[PDB]
């Protein structure tokens, strides 16, 4: 089927996500201190 | 089956990931300008 196929992209967009929440709170102690 | 549960899994992770995507525009314009 296309089981793989959302568990790809629930890693994919997990992956993606990581790294944005990263950045929001790089950006933020920055531009908050 | 559990094809829903990867379905809605995609989509909070995805609407996660755009706000995230968003607050690191937001604050890189802010702390790089």
């Given at each position: 089927?296309?089981?793989?196929?959302?568990?790809?992209?629930?890693?994919?967009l997990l992956?993606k996500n990581y790294?944005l929440?990263?950045?929001?709170?790089?950006?933020?102690?920055?531009?908050?201190?």
């Open positions: 089927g296309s089981m793989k196929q959302l568990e790809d992209k629930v890693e994919e992956s790294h929440e990263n950045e929001v709170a790089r950006l933020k102690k920055l531009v908050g201190e």
